Write an enzyme that holds these catalytic residues in place. Structure first.
Site, PDB file in Angstrom:
ATOM      1  N   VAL A  30       0.825  -0.992   0.086  1.00  0.00           N
ATOM      2  CA  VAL A  30       0.084  -0.017  -0.027  1.00  0.00           C
ATOM      3  C   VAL A  30       1.132   1.283  -0.099  1.00  0.00           C
ATOM      4  O   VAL A  30       0.769   2.086  -0.954  1.00  0.00           O
ATOM      5  CB  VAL A  30      -0.990  -0.099   1.233  1.00  0.00           C
ATOM      6  CG1 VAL A  30      -1.748   1.537   1.105  1.00  0.00           C
ATOM      7  CG2 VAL A  30      -1.937  -1.160   1.327  1.00  0.00           C
ATOM      8  N   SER A  32       4.923   3.044   1.933  1.00  0.00           N
ATOM      9  CA  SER A  32       6.083   3.113   2.616  1.00  0.00           C
ATOM     10  C   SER A  32       5.996   4.400   3.645  1.00  0.00           C
ATOM     11  O   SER A  32       5.415   5.168   3.120  1.00  0.00           O
ATOM     12  CB  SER A  32       7.283   2.980   1.897  1.00  0.00           C
ATOM     13  OG  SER A  32       7.431   1.825   1.143  1.00  0.00           O
ATOM     14  N   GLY A  33       6.423   4.306   4.798  1.00  0.00           N
ATOM     15  CA  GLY A  33       6.180   5.430   5.749  1.00  0.00           C
ATOM     16  C   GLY A  33       7.547   5.696   6.414  1.00  0.00           C
ATOM     17  O   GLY A  33       8.850   5.188   5.960  1.00  0.00           O
ATOM     18  N   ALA A  34       7.700   6.609   7.454  1.00  0.00           N
ATOM     19  CA  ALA A  34       8.831   6.965   8.154  1.00  0.00           C
ATOM     20  C   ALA A  34       9.138   6.212   9.116  1.00  0.00           C
ATOM     21  O   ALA A  34      10.281   5.954   9.622  1.00  0.00           O
ATOM     22  CB  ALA A  34       8.485   8.513   8.624  1.00  0.00           C
ATOM     23  N   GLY A  36       7.434   3.039   9.255  1.00  0.00           N
ATOM     24  CA  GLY A  36       7.161   1.483   9.024  1.00  0.00           C
ATOM     25  C   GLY A  36       6.680   1.515   7.445  1.00  0.00           C
ATOM     26  O   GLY A  36       6.749   2.306   6.732  1.00  0.00           O
ATOM     27  N   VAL A  38       3.022  -0.349   4.768  1.00  0.00           N
ATOM     28  CA  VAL A  38       1.717  -0.847   5.176  1.00  0.00           C
ATOM     29  C   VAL A  38       1.449  -1.708   3.837  1.00  0.00           C
ATOM     30  O   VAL A  38       1.858  -1.554   2.596  1.00  0.00           O
ATOM     31  CB  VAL A  38       0.630   0.263   5.204  1.00  0.00           C
ATOM     32  CG1 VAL A  38      -0.737  -0.365   5.385  1.00  0.00           C
ATOM     33  CG2 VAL A  38       0.929   1.232   6.364  1.00  0.00           C
ATOM     34  N   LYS A  53       0.292  -2.799   9.045  1.00  0.00           N
ATOM     35  CA  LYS A  53       1.624  -2.057   9.090  1.00  0.00           C
ATOM     36  C   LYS A  53       2.754  -2.721   9.855  1.00  0.00           C
ATOM     37  O   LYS A  53       2.467  -3.220  10.797  1.00  0.00           O
ATOM     38  CB  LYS A  53       1.075  -0.646  10.099  1.00  0.00           C
ATOM     39  CG  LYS A  53       2.471   0.136  10.218  1.00  0.00           C
ATOM     40  CD  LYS A  53       2.175   1.259  11.200  1.00  0.00           C
ATOM     41  CE  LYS A  53       3.432   2.174  11.474  1.00  0.00           C
ATOM     42  NZ  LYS A  53       3.270   3.099  12.291  1.00  0.00           N
ATOM     43  N   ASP A 149      -1.927  17.142  14.805  1.00  0.00           N
ATOM     44  CA  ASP A 149      -1.597  17.161  13.215  1.00  0.00           C
ATOM     45  C   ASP A 149      -2.888  16.740  12.419  1.00  0.00           C
ATOM     46  O   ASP A 149      -2.384  15.867  11.430  1.00  0.00           O
ATOM     47  CB  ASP A 149      -0.369  16.375  12.998  1.00  0.00           C
ATOM     48  CG  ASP A 149       0.222  16.847  11.691  1.00  0.00           C
ATOM     49  OD1 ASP A 149      -0.028  17.771  11.140  1.00  0.00           O
ATOM     50  OD2 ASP A 149       0.934  15.843  11.239  1.00  0.00           O
TER      51      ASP A 149
HETATM   52  C1  LIG Z   1      -0.446   7.124  16.128  1.00  0.00           C
HETATM   53  N1  LIG Z   1      -1.963   7.347  16.119  1.00  0.00           N
HETATM   54  N2  LIG Z   1      -2.745   8.105  16.785  1.00  0.00           N
HETATM   55  C2  LIG Z   1      -3.990   7.444  16.370  1.00  0.00           C
HETATM   56  C3  LIG Z   1      -5.242   8.195  16.834  1.00  0.00           C
HETATM   57  C4  LIG Z   1      -6.037   8.732  15.442  1.00  0.00           C
HETATM   58  C5  LIG Z   1      -6.009   6.985  17.619  1.00  0.00           C
HETATM   59  C6  LIG Z   1      -5.093   9.298  17.852  1.00  0.00           C
HETATM   60  C7  LIG Z   1      -3.543   6.636  15.480  1.00  0.00           C
HETATM   61  C8  LIG Z   1      -2.417   6.442  15.246  1.00  0.00           C
HETATM   62  N3  LIG Z   1      -1.746   5.532  14.312  1.00  0.00           N
HETATM   63  C9  LIG Z   1      -2.149   5.323  12.929  1.00  0.00           C
HETATM   64  O1  LIG Z   1      -3.206   5.975  12.523  1.00  0.00           O
HETATM   65  N4  LIG Z   1      -1.542   4.393  12.166  1.00  0.00           N
HETATM   66  C10 LIG Z   1      -1.766   3.927  10.805  1.00  0.00           C
HETATM   67  C11 LIG Z   1      -2.304   4.727   9.633  1.00  0.00           C
HETATM   68  C12 LIG Z   1      -2.656   4.314   8.569  1.00  0.00           C
HETATM   69  C13 LIG Z   1      -2.232   3.262   8.157  1.00  0.00           C
HETATM   70  O2  LIG Z   1      -2.335   2.677   6.708  1.00  0.00           O
HETATM   71  C14 LIG Z   1      -3.682   2.257   6.308  1.00  0.00           C
HETATM   72  C15 LIG Z   1      -4.667   1.791   7.459  1.00  0.00           C
HETATM   73  C16 LIG Z   1      -5.735   1.587   7.222  1.00  0.00           C
HETATM   74  N5  LIG Z   1      -6.237   1.576   5.826  1.00  0.00           N
HETATM   75  C17 LIG Z   1      -5.211   1.831   4.802  1.00  0.00           C
HETATM   76  C18 LIG Z   1      -3.995   2.214   5.194  1.00  0.00           C
HETATM   77  C19 LIG Z   1      -1.554   2.329   8.969  1.00  0.00           C
HETATM   78  C20 LIG Z   1      -1.255   2.936  10.222  1.00  0.00           C
END
Ligand SMILES: Cn1nc(C(C)(C)C)cc1NC(=O)Nc1ccc(Oc2ccncc2)cc1
Length: 338
Positions: A30, A32-34, A36, A38, A53, A149
Site C-alpha cells: 500500500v 512506505s512510511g517514516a 514502517g 503498510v 502495518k 496534526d
Molecule cells: C499514532 N496514532 N494515533 C492515532 C489516533 C487517531 C487514534 C489518535 C492513530 C495512530 N496511528 C495510525 O493511524 N497508524 C496507521 C495509519 C494508517 C495506516 O495505513 C492504512 C490503514 C488503514 N487503511 C489503509 C491504510 C496504518 C497505520
C-alpha cells in the site's frame, strides 16, 4: 528455539520481506512510511480486507521504541467508529532475542481526503464527512488525547465515504492552529477544531485556505480571514512581541464569512466562523460543534459517544532501556485479544 512462530510464512512485499501468520493472505503493498510500511491483506477466516502495518526497526533507539509502543496503546484504547482501530497485533518472534519488530492489523481504508480533495464537494458530503470527523474528535478528546496534526491525509475514507481519523506519523503547516505555530498562548483541545475548519473550508472552495513561506506570512494569510483580533484576545497572549506586533498592525475588522465564502450556506459560514476562531476560549469544541444546525440531517446523539476511560499511559514520562521497552511491547502483544 525457532526462526519464527509456527504458522508464520515468509513473503516479499514491495521488495522487503514480511512475516505473516497463515490466516492473512494475498499481501499487497500500500505504502512506505517514516516508521514502517503498510500492506493490505485478506483475512481468510471471514474474507475481509484488512491493512497491516509492519514496524520498521522499532528497537533502533529508545525514541523509536516509545513511539511504536505509544501507537500500539492508542489504537488498542480507542474504540470508535470514526477512529482507526486495532483488529490484531502480532510478531513472528518466538523470544526476546528474536523480537525485532511487530505488526498491527487495522480495517482497510481505500483512500483519504487528501487524495479525493478537489471533487468540489456538495454540502451534503461536507456535512456528512465533517460530522464524522467531529465525532471521532469528540471521542479521542474525551479520552484526553489531542491529535495536534489533523489534515486531509490523516482522514481515511472508503467508497461509501465512511471516515476514520488517522495519524500516519509526525515544513507545511496549513492546517495547524495559529497558537501552535506562534506559541503565543497555550493551546487546548480545540487546536484540532481549527484544523477541521481549514479542511471544511477547502472542501467548500477546492483550494487550501492558509499557506505561506514562513510563519509570519501564514499569520498574515490567517488574519485576512479572521481579521485583526481586538482587546479581549490580545490580553490573553503570553508573547509580548506578538501582542505588540498585532497591536501595531492595521486593525482590520473581521469576517462576514458570507463575503469570504460567497458560495457557502448561512449555516456553513456560521459554523466556519466559530471553528476558525483565534481565541481558543471561544473556539468550538468537538461536542459543541456537533450540535450545530449544519449537521441537522445527520445528527444522532447516540453516535457521539465518549471514551469510557482516559488514555492512561503511566510510562509516557518513563525512560527505560530499549530492552526494557521491548519487554513492555512484548507483554502488550502477548495479552492482546480481539
Ligand atoms: C499514532 N496514532 N494515533 C492515532 C489516533 C487517531 C487514534 C489518535 C492513530 C495512530 N496511528 C495510525 O493511524 N497508524 C496507521 C495509519 C494508517 C495506516 O495505513 C492504512 C490503514 C488503514 N487503511 C489503509 C491504510 C496504518 C497505520
Amino acid at each position: 528455539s525457532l526462526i519464527r512462530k509456527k504458522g508464520f510464512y515468509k513473503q516479499d512485499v514491495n521488495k522487503t520481506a514480511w512475516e505473516l501468520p497463515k490466516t492473512y493472505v494475498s499481501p499487497t503493498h500500500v505504502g512506505s512510511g517514516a516508521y514502517g510500511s503498510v500492506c493490505s491483506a485478506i483475512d481468510k477466516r471471514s474474507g475481509e480486507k484488512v491493512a497491516i502495518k509492519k514496524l520498521s526497526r522499532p528497537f533502533q533507539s529508545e525514541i523509536f521504541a516509545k513511539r511504536a509502543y505509544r501507537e500500539l496503546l492508542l489504537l488498542k484504547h480507542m474504540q470508535h467508529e470514526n477512529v482507526i482501530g486495532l483488529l490484531d497485533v502480532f510478531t513472528p518472534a518466538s523470544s526476546l532475542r528474536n523480537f525485532y519488530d511487530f505488526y498491527l492489523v487495522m480495517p482497510f481504508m481505500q483512500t483519504d481526503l487528501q487524495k479525493i480533495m478537489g471533487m468540489e464537494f456538495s454540502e451534503e458530503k461536507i456535512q456528512y464527512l465533517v460530522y464524522q470527523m467531529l465525532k471521532g474528535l469528540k471521542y479521542i478528546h474525551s479520552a484526553g488525547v489531542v491529535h495536534r496534526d489533523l489534515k486531509p491525509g490523516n482522514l481515511a475514507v472508503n467508497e461509501d465515504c465512511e471516515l476514520k481519523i488517522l495519524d500516519f506519523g509526525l515544513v507545511t503547516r496549513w492546517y495547524r492552529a495559529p497558537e501552535v505555530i506562534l506559541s503565543w498562548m497555550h493551546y487546548n483541545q480545540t487546536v484540532d477544531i481549527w484544523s477541521v475548519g481549514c479542511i471544511m473550508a477547502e472542501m467548500l472552495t477546492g483550494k487550501t485556505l492558509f499557506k505561506g513561506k514562513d510563519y509570519l506570512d501564514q499569520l498574515t494569510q490567517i488574519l485576512k480571514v479572521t481579521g485583526v483580533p481586538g482587546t479581549e484576545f490580545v490580553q490573553k497572549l503570553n508573547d509580548k512581541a506578538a501582542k505588540s506586533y498585532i497591536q501595531s498592525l492595521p486593525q482590520t475588522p473581521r469576517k462576514d464569512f458570507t463575503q469570504l465564502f460567497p458560495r457557502a450556506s448561512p449555516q456553513a459560514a456560521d459554523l466556519l466562523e466559530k471553528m476558525l476562531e483565534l481565541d481558543v476560549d471561544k473556539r468550538l469544541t468537538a461536542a459543541q460543534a456537533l450540535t450545530h444546525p449544519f449537521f441537522e440531517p445527520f445528527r444522532d446523539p447516540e453516535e457521539e459517544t465518549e471514551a469510557q476511560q482516559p488514555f492512561d499511559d503511566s510510562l509516557e514520562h518513563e525512560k527505560l532501556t530499549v530492552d526494557e521497552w521491548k519487554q513492555h511491547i512484548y507483554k502488550e502483544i502477548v495479552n492482546f485479544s480481539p
